[PDB]
Symmetry: C2
Subunit: 95 residues, 2 copies
């Protein structure tokens, strides 16, 4: 197939009382990813209800699947309690 822009959606389970630590962890990772070829933008969303399943959900845009996968492999090398993400790639199918 041909490359096309993709969206990473990564919902996080944030431990009780550890939101700021989770944000700052996320920021360190964003700073690495933002330097990678194909990175376009991101929006880290915080739940209005602290009891939401996912108190943080990141939504990032990449130029292609290849660029994202290449960047994810590099981060395992560069950057390697209880914070749990579930990243997957998406495309928009309805509006």
């Amino acid at each position: 197939g041909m490359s096309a822009p993709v969206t990473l959606i990564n919902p996080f389970k944030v431990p009780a009382d550890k939101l700021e630590a989770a944000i700052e962890y996320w920021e360190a990772h964003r700073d690495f990813m933002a330097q990678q070829p194909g990175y376009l933008s991101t929006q880290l969303h915080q739940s209005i209800d602290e009891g939401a399943t996912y108190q943080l959900i990141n939504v990032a845009i990449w130029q292609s699947e290849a660029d994202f996968y290449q960047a994810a492999q590099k981060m395992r090398q560069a950057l390697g309690e209880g914070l749990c993400g579930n990243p997957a790639l998406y495309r928009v199918i309805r509006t």
Copy 2:
């Protein structure tokens, strides 16, 4: 507090082999919500990997929390196997 635009993020667990049915269910609901005061836009995202936890994730923008909650109460009245959402409201905190 003062009202401000909010984002609904609703990740769906889609039963094996039932993606199209789930889309069409989602569309019927979108058609109701799109008529409600304060509805701004939506983007229904489909996973590139059929094995993702959430093969569909909707991301919708509403003018305020009040508008969304008002619309959600109305849909329970108007519209009432195994498809499971987890809606919550968010605001963007980092980019």
